[PDB]
Every structure is written in structure tokens, then in C-alpha cells.
Amino acid sequence: PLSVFGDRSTGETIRSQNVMAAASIANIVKSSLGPVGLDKMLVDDIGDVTITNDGATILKLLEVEHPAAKVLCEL
Amino acid sequence: QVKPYVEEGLHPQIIIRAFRTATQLAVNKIKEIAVTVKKADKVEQRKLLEKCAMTALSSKLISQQKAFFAKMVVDAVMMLDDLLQLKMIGIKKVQGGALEDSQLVA
Amino acid sequence: NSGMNPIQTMTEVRARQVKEMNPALGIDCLHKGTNDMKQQHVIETLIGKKQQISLATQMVRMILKIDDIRKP
Amino acid sequence: ASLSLAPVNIFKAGADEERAETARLTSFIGAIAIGDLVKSTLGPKGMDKILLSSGRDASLMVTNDGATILKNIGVDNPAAKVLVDMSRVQDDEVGDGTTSVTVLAAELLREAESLIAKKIHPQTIIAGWREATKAAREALLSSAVDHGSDE
Amino acid sequence: ASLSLAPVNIFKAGADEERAETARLTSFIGAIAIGDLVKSTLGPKGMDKILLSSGRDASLMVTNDGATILKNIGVDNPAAKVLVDMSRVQDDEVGDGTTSVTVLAAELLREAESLIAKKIHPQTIIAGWREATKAAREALLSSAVDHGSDEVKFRQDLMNIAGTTLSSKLLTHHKDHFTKLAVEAVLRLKGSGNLEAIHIIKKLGGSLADSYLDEGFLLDKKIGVNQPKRIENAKILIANTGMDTDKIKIFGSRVRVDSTAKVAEIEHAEKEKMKEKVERILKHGINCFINRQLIYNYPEQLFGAAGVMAIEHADFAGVERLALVTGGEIASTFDHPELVKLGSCKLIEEVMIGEDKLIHFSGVALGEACTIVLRGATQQILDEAERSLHDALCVLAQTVKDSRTVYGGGCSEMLMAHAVTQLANRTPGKEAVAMESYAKALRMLPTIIADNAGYDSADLVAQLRAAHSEGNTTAGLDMREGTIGDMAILGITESFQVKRQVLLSAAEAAEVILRVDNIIKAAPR
Amino acid sequence: RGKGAYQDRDKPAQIRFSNISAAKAVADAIRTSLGPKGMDKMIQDGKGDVTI
Amino acid sequence: LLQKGIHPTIISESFQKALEKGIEILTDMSRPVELSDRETLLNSATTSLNSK
Amino acid sequence: LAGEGISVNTGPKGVINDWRRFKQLETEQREEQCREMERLIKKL
Amino acid sequence: GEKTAGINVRKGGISNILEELVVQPLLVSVSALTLATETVRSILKIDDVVNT
Ligand SMILES: Nc1ncnc2c1ncn2[C@@H]1O[C@H](COP(=O)(O)OP(=O)(O)O)[C@@H](O)[C@H]1O
Ligand SMILES: Nc1ncnc2c1ncn2[C@@H]1O[C@H](COP(=O)(O)OP(=O)(O)O)[C@@H](O)[C@H]1O
Ligand SMILES: Nc1ncnc2c1ncn2[C@@H]1O[C@H](COP(=O)(O)OP(=O)(O)O)[C@@H](O)[C@H]1O
Numbered sequence A: 001p002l003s004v005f006g007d008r009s010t011g012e013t014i015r016s017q018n019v020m021a022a023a024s025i026a027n028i029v030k031s032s033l034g035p036v037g038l039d040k041m042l043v044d045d046i047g048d049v050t051i052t053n054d055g056a057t058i059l060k061l062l063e064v065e066h067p068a069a070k071v072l073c074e075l
Numbered sequence B: 001q002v003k004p005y006v007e008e009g010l011h012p013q014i015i016i017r018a019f020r021t022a023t024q025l026a027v028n029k030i031k032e033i034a035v036t037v038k039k040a041d042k043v044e045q046r047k048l049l050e051k052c053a054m055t056a057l058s059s060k061l062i063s064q065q066k067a068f069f070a071k072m073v074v075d076a077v078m079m080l081d082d083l084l085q086l087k088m089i090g091i092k093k094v095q096g097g098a099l100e101d102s103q104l105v106a
Numbered sequence C: 001n002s003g004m005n006p007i008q009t010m011t012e013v014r015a016r017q018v019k020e021m022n023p024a025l026g027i028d029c030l031h032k033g034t035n036d037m038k039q040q041h042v043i044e045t046l047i048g049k050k051q052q053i054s055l056a057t058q059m060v061r062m063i064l065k066i067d068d069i070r071k072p
Numbered sequence D: 001a002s003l004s005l006a007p008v009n010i011f012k013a014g015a016d017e018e019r020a021e022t023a024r025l026t027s028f029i030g031a032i033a034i035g036d037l038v039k040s041t042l043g044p045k046g047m048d049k050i051l052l053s054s055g056r057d058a059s060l061m062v063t064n065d066g067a068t069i070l071k072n073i074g075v076d077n078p079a080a081k082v083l084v085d086m087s088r089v090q091d092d093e094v095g096d097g098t099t100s101v102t103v104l105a106a107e108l109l110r111e112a113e114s115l116i117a118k119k120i121h122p123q124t125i126i127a128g129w130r131e132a133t134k135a136a137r138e139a140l141l142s143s144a145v146d147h148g149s150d151e
Numbered sequence E: 001a002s003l004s005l006a007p008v009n010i011f012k013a014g015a016d017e018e019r020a021e022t023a024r025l026t027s028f029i030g031a032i033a034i035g036d037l038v039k040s041t042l043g044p045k046g047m048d049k050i051l052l053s054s055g056r057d058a059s060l061m062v063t064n065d066g067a068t069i070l071k072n073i074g075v076d077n078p079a080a081k082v083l084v085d086m087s088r089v090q091d092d093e094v095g096d097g098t099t100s101v102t103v104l105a106a107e108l109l110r111e112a113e114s115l116i117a118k119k120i121h122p123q124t125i126i127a128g129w130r131e132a133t134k135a136a137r138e139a140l141l142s143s144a145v146d147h148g149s150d151e152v153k154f155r156q157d158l159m160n161i162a163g164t165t166l167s168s169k170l171l172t173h174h175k176d177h178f179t180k181l182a183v184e185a186v187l188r189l190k191g192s193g194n195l196e197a198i199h200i201i202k203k204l205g206g207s208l209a210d211s212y213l214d215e216g217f218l219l220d221k222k223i224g225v226n227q228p229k230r231i232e233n234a235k236i237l238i239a240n241t242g243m244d245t246d247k248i249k250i251f252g253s254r255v256r257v258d259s260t261a262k263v264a265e266i267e268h269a270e271k272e273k274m275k276e277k278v279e280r281i282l283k284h285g286i287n288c289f290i291n292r293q294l295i296y297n298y299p300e301q302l303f304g305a306a307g308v309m310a311i312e313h314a315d316f317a318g319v320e321r322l323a324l325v326t327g328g329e330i331a332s333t334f335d336h337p338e339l340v341k342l343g344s345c346k347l348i349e350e351v352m353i354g355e356d357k358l359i360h361f362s363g364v365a366l367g368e369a370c371t372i373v374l375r376g377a378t379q380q381i382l383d384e385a386e387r388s389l390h391d392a393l394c395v396l397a398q399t400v401k402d403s404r405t406v407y408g409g410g411c412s413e414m415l416m417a418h419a420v421t422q423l424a425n426r427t428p429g430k431e432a433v434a435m436e437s438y439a440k441a442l443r444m445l446p447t448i449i450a451d452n453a454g455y456d457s458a459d460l461v462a463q464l465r466a467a468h469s470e471g472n473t474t475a476g477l478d479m480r481e482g483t484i485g486d487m488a489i490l491g492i493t494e495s496f497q498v499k500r501q502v503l504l505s506a507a508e509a510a511e512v513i514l515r516v517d518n519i520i521k522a523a524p525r
Numbered sequence F: 001r002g003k004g005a006y007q008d009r010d011k012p013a014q015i016r017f018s019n020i021s022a023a024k025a026v027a028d029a030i031r032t033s034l035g036p037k038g039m040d041k042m043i044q045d046g047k048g049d050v051t052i
Numbered sequence G: 001l002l003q004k005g006i007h008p009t010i011i012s013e014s015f016q017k018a019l020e021k022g023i024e025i026l027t028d029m030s031r032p033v034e035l036s037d038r039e040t041l042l043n044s045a046t047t048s049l050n051s052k
Numbered sequence H: 001l002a003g004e005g006i007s008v009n010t011g012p013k014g015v016i017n018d019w020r021r022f023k024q025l026e027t028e029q030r031e032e033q034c035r036e037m038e039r040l041i042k043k044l
Numbered sequence I: 001g002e003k004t005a006g007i008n009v010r011k012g013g014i015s016n017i018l019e020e021l022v023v024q025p026l027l028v029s030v031s032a033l034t035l036a037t038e039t040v041r042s043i044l045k046i047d048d049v050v051n052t
């Protein structure tokens, strides 16, 4: 009926998807919090290695597709 | 409900023990407060069975005729002798006709 | 199907049925000059009409109760 | 809302429906094609036709019979199938008249197409044709002559 | 034997040919398909069409115009191409009558197909159609009435013609308003046939009834930074000079010096040249200056310092329209101010139309140029309103050029076909049958007009035929209720030129298509 | 008055129904974004652009 | 309306009549407002922003 | 078999979704083939 | 007779909204009604779709 060339999500589905993306982003960096936190080792698929604990650097280096995850990274 | 406690590192055995204790208490409470009639009155027992059948039926597409179906179900169960075997209640489906046209054959 | 205007004809027939108590007034599909189906001998079984109404209502209820599809 | 022209899809893959104007156009086209094919083989000055089979044998058949022509053709138009069955049944009932009945049916359907284009309900056309058929049959019966008494 | 049906093959790969029966079949099918498509958009109760482009932009167009429908379709049938070109030429010659001529040609070709099925040589049909066309043209010419002598009667005829033209379009909702608008816009041209002197500006938003014909003129251009935004009793000078990094037209010239001081001196000399040109322009004693080309920063700063409004980048159409509406002369030299006429108007200001700002010329001197503001709810509505208004303006201009008028509503076709029938029943041979088919097509035109309204087309056409048979030469299709009536009283008037062109073009195209007995196509590229 | 004119096409009715269905679908799409309690829609175009 | 046998031209004219009547009705409900009244302007802006 | 002036009209309207879904992949394949053949054949 | 009775989201029922400061200019509802009616009338005068 809409005849819109694309996919559509509505209701609890999209809300749960956004919360999923936000929770995934949070869980990415949850292990690098506080003095008993530990660093992460990022590889840039060309051999370049980055070791860091800073959340901003980790979120900038990661490839993000979901808009809510992008919102959290920009935050 | 227990997912947030799992996420924060609570040991699963504590949750299992809590579930077991709560379930035992709930089952005991249900058995304690359940209402029973200690009279074996035929009319009262039939009314109880009909009400239970209506409650079990008032969630389906036949809920509009729940009294009729409940009465027939109670009659069919009461006609069973001692084992209440499910194979002793034949169910025949014939296409066409209204739901009120359904009949129980003695 | 007979070419007449639906809303006007149906409204006129209903108004005639209300005015003069006669449930035999219908749609003059064959253009016989009268609406009284008793005179035109347009007769159908009561059982057929009752089954029509009952089956239609039951199927409509069963369709309305469905709120999810899981095609492969 | 037409069944095919609806946002939801009802028919299976490969299934389709043709509505009023499309169905009438298809039926009239098929009937007129059959009538034009069968005709020109009518009357004393009719001409025969060559039927080449596409099978392995490739049987060759030249004939003037309307039923024979209509039988050995690959027909996909349903109205053409109706006319072919009409011709076959006419041949079964009596020996002759297959070409005549096919041409008459085609001409009647052409006139029906013209009348439909002239904004006439097909039920009115059918009623008029029933009256005309009754009158024509009565007139034809009233003109029949019998000579079975005299050898 | 034929080229295709020969044991040897004579053609390139992909080329083919169609002989008499097949060529006639294809041509008739194509022409009848075009006629059936373009029809149902005819008469007061005709509907519109949606033209959904399949290209990358996917342009959406809603229109009742037959010419625009026929031109914007992928056509492979050659006879359909002939009919499409006929409709395009019909639109080029006069604004209205594209659907009528296309439908008439299609009906003529359908009758020709029937006659060919009746075993009649196409040459006989062509001769009979030539005779019928002569008779119908003579009858229509004799039926024409002229009202150019009387001013009030001519204005009434113009009103009736504009209303009849707009009756079939989307503007029929507000027919009186748009009729008066178009008539006033055409009368403001003072006999000039240049429809480009009338500008149609489409602004989204607002109702269709909000459209109006401006009492002065409107420009969609801007003003300089430091120039006045409002001038009273303006003296306008229209120009077509460069005034932008103005280069001496000696293309081989160059600056060659040995120091940068000389370069600075040459730059100052160029600036002084531009300043002197601006001073010469100002010597004309003007308040508003309009230039066709762009005006750069230095000339516009000089204009602002002199308190003179300078409008730049008004294209050839813009400068022509300002010259027409204000009476100024487009100048490119400023050495003889006494030999240049300056446009004059009471007021120039900026008006706020929608979310855009335009320059408004009010109290113009001549006014032989019009701007029409079209307001609509959708882009399609605005486009269709513009097309309908263009048709009305074209027909009104044609009527101004030639004041002879005929009666619409099928009356003209009815009298044409009556004359054709009177000729047909006076001629022996199958040419009589060909002329009868011509008359049948002429009848079919108002038959389709009545069918589009859901009326009893057969009965109404029979009544019209009878009425024209007794002698009622003004009877037609009264579309208000579905009866017949006098079109002299009802004022369903239409231009004689449009009807004559429709008849002649339809007959010509039918004749040229009927002559074809072999269609040969080369290998497509 | 009688049978009346017979509509032998039925294509215009189908076109009208299709147009109305499309418009109603568009309204139902933008129906939940109305009033002080209406929420927002996040739209991702052909490119990576996101608009709430 | 169309399924009832109504031509899609009487519908348009009747809708135009209804639109004119509704415009008159809305004009009846109107209340004059002056730009010097800051409270009405603030209320209008707040009502506009309530849904965002 | 007549009526070659089909005027398919709103037929393709109901299939723009599937047609465009196929056309996107077709365009991607054509672009990939063109980029592959930009070097090859030209002076292979 | 309650001319200004409207939906009160804050209260949860029906009450006067002039006390809730929910007001809008007349040339929003009037424009919406006029343009919507015009668009509907334009759509109703369509009976075919052609692919170019
Ligand atoms: N000698 C004849 N003179 C005139 N008409 C004839 C003659 N012979 C046959 N016909 C006509 O030819 C028509 C077709 O006959 P025919 O082709 O033999 O079989 P069918 O009736 O199956 O087509 C008949 O209706 C008949 O009227
Ligand atoms: N008010 C009316 N009453 C009767 N006939 C009309 C009226 N308005 C237009 N017509 C007829 O409709 C025909 C077609 O006009 P129209 O569709 O406006 O442009 P075109 O000639 O391009 O089709 C004309 O021949 C005219 O006679
Ligand atoms: N606080 C409120 N209480 C009740 N209704 C409101 C309130 N704020 C806005 N509305 C109503 O919500 C409607 C929709 O406005 P909105 O959601 O902004 O979209 P739009 O302005 O495009 O209609 C308006 O007609 C307005 O009357």
C-alpha cells in the first residue's frame, strides 16, 4: 500500500532494536571502566594495531552502522 | 526479572535456590487457600464443572457459545465411566453449518 | 447488476418497507413494474438465508481474531 | 478494487485474471479470429486449407470441413475453445453446418462487441437475442416443406 | 510473390515488411488505439490522465490536453506516430482541438476499416472523403457568424469562447473567474499576437481561486545591495549592455608594460571607463535601470551611490516584456540620451508572494504585457492550470485575429454531417457509402461527448440529427442536464478557425494513412 | 428511468480505488506523528543520511 | 461514496460546498488578535512547539 | 492475436518495487563488469 | 454549546482548552482545509494512468 522502496519498522520492534544497539555499544566499552578496567587491542585490518582504554578513541575506530549506535559514538 | 542481577555478576546458584524456595511457598499457599466443596452434591459439582469449562473456554473463537459447549463437554465427561479415556469421546468435524448446529450424540 | 442506481433504489425500498409494513419489498431486478416479491414469486428458503448469515458471521469473527501471519 | 489490481497479492505465480473490458476484448478477439479463419471456406466457391502438423510425423491435411480445421489447431483463447467445441458438437449431431455455425457465432459476437461499445448492457443483448432466436426458429419452421409421402 | 514470403531472403537481419492486409490491420489498430486513449478526455465531463514517466527523474504529470498526452508516450506503431504528429501540429496551429482532431481521425479510420471489410477499394473511399470534406467545409463556412464590428457583442463572444475552452479542463471549477482573467489578459495585448508577452507565474500554495491577473507587471529578479527598494513615478531605462568586466572588443589587445605602477594605472583607467559609462547612463535622468545581462559589483555600487535602482539579469523575454509594458527602448549605447525613450510607471516595489519576493511594476504606461500568478495546492495542479490557461489564451488570440465563430456542443459537427449526408444521398456508387461513413464519424464526435457524461448518447444524437434535419441549425448538446437546446442562447461559442483546422487535419491524416498498403521497417539501431 | 448507460470499462473505478488506497496508506503512515503525544520518525535515505 | 453508485463529479461539487460551509464555520469560531498582545503570540508558539 | 497497441498503462505500476529491486542489482553488476572491462579488451 | 471544548492530554479527558492555552491561527486550519479539498477534487478528476 505504501509502495515505498525500502524497509519499515514500527512499534516495539524499532524501540527494541535501538535499545539493542545502545546496549551493544555500552557493552563494547563496559570492560574498560575504573582502575580495575583493562585496555583493548584494535586492529585496522591492514596490520595497524591500536591499544587504548579511552572510550572516544575506541568508538571512533570502530565501524558503526546502526543510527543509534552512531548517536552514542558521537555522544 | 533476574536478568539485571545476572548482568551484575550474581551467582546463578543463589537465583536457583531463591526460585525453588519461592515456588515451594507459592505451591503451599495455593493448596492452602484453594476453595473446595466437601459435600459431593451432584448439582453443586455439576455447576462447578460447568463454570470451570466456561472459564477454560472463554478465550477462544467459540467463546460466544461457551455455555452451550461447556454443557455438552460436562455431559460428555460425566458419561465416561471410570478412567475418563480420551479415546472414548469421538470428535467428528463436518464442514458447513453454524456452531450452534454442533451436537453431542448420547 | 440490473443497471439501476444502487443507493437511490435501496433507500426508496427501505423507506417503503418502513412506511407500509411489508417485508416482501425488494429490488425489481427484472423490471416487472412492481417491488412486491410476493407477487413476483421470488422465493428462497429460510434455512438458506439463516445459514448464509451464520456462516458469514462466523468466518468474519474467525478472520478478525487473527492478528499474526508467519508465512515461510 | 480489482483482485489483480490490489496492493496485496492473492493469485499464485503464473495465475492472472482479466476484468470486464479485458475479458470481453479477449473473448471477442478469439471469436473473431476463429470466424475469419473458418470463413472464406463457405459456399460453393469456398477454398480449402492446408494443415501442417508440427509433430514428428508432420501429417499433411488439406480440407474444407470447418470442424476438421477447428479440431487440428492449437487453441489457447478460451472463447475460441468454446467455438471449437460448438463446431465439434454440430458435426456430431449433423454432418454439415460446422462452418455455418462457426461463422454465425462469430458474426453474432462481433455485433455484440459493437453493441457493448454502444453502451448496452449485455443482459439486454441476451434478452433481445433470445427473442430473435425464437422468432427466427418459428419462421424457419413455418417455411419447411415435407416430401416424404411421394417417393 | 512478396519479399518476405519468397524462397530467397531479401532483407537485412531484423528488417521486415507487412503487405496489404497486415499493414492495414496494424495501421487501423494503432490509430484506433490512439483514438480510444485520447478520448474520454473530451467535452465538459471529460476526465484527466496521469503520465508517470519511467525515467530516472520519474516526472509525474496530470493533464487533460490531448497533445501533451500523445507526445509523452512511447509509440512504435507508425500510424500512431502519424496521429501524434497530427496532434502536435494541431496544437502548434491553434491552442485547442487536439483531442477532437485525433478522435475524428480515429473514427474515420475505423469507418475506413469497415468499408475495406465491405470490399471497397481505398481509392473510392478517399475520393468520397474528399467530396465529403469539401461539402462539410462549405457548410461550416456558411454557418460561421462574425461579430467583430460590435464591441460589446465581440466581448460577449470572447467570454463565451473562453468559457467553452475552459469547460473541459480543471479550471472549470472556477470557470467564471478564469474566463474573465483570460479575456482581460488577451484584451490587454491590444491586438498583438505574441502570447509570449503574457507571462504565467506558478507559485505553490493557496487555492486555485487565488489566482489573479496583475494590474501591472511582476518580475522575479533582485535589486542591488545599496539601491532603493521603492520608487514612485519611476523613469525606467531598459538596456542590453555588458556592464560586467567590460572588455574592449579588440580580442588581440593586451597590456604590456615594464612596471607594476603602469599596471595599476591601467586598472584605474578601466575603472574610470566603467564609471564614465555609468555616468552616461545616469545622464538620461532615470530612477530604475534594467539590464539584460549581469551587473557587477562596481557598477551596482555606483548605481547605489546615485540612488538608482538597478535590476540585473532580466533575460531577453524579461527585457522584451518590460519594454512592452512600460514603453521603454532597449538600448546598448548611451551617447544620445534624447533619442532613447524611457519607460514609465507609477510605482515599483517588492511584493511578498508565498515565500518568495518579486518586483512589482504598478501603474504602467502601456501595459501591453501581462503577468498571471497561478496559485495551487500541488505542482500537477499548477502545471495543468498553466496548460489550460495557455489553451484559452491561444484560442482567444486566434479569435481576435479572426472573429468568425461557430457553435460548439456538437452543433457544428451535426450540420457538417447533415450536409455530408445530403451530398451522399445525391451520389451513385460506393462513394455514397464512403461519405455516409464520413458522416457517421462526424456523428460519433458528439456521441463521444455525450457518452463521457453518462448520458443517453444514442437518443441525444438521434434528436440532434432530427433537429438539424428539420432546419434547426443551432441545436446542440445541452450538457447542464442532458437535453438539447439553442447554443445561440446558451452561448456555447467556438472559433471557426479551430473547427476548420480540426476537420481539414483529420481528413488529411485519414487520407494519408489510408493510402498505405505496405509497411517496411529497417533493422532497428 | 431504466437500465441507464452501461459502464463497460471499469478501469476508471480501479484507478480511483488505487489512488484512494495509496492516499489512505500515506495518511496511516503519517498518522501516529500528530499532536503533543505524537512521536518522531527516523528515515535513512539511499545514502547514509539519517533524519529524525 | 463511489461504491454507492455516485459519480465522481457530484462528489467534487458537494465537497466544494462543504468546504465553503466549513470555511464560514471556522471564520465564525475565530477571535480577533492584535500583535501587541504578547500572551497570544507566546501561546501560539508554545502550541506549535508542543508536538516536537 | 490483435490489439498490439497494448498501452500497458498502470500494469508496471504494481511491479515497480520488484522491478527496481532487480534493477539495482542489475546496475551494480553492469558497473562491476564495466570496471572489470575498463582495463581488459581495451588493449589486452 | 461548548465552542472551545477540546482534547486535554494533560488532564486526560475533555475540557476547555482556552484554559490550557492551546490556540492556533485561523490561517492554518483554513489553509489545510482549502488545500486538502482542492487536492481531493483534483484527484477525483482522474480516470487513467499512462506510462511514458
Ligand atoms: N449450389 C448452391 N447455390 C447456392 N448456395 C449454396 C450452394 N451450395 C451450397 N450453398 C451454400 O453454402 C453454404 C455452406 O455449405 P457448406 O460449405 O457445404 O457446408 P457448411 O454449411 O458446413 O459450411 C450453405 O449454407 C448453402 O446455403
Ligand atoms: N459547455 C459545453 N457544452 C457543450 N459542449 C462543449 C462545452 N464545452 C466544450 N464542449 C465541446 O467539447 C469539445 C472538446 O473540447 P475540449 O475537450 O475543451 O478541447 P479539445 O477540442 O482539445 O478536446 C469541443 O468540440 C466542444 O464542442
Ligand atoms: N497541548 C496540546 N493539547 C491538545 N492538543 C494539542 C496540543 N498541542 C498541539 N495540539 C494539537 O495537535 C495538532 C497537531 O499538531 P502537530 O502535531 O504539531 O502537527 P501539525 O502542526 O502538522 O498538525 C494540532 O492541530 C493541535 O491542535
Ligand SMILES: [Mg+2]
Pocket: E096, E097, E165, E166, E168, E391
Ligand atoms: Mg479544449
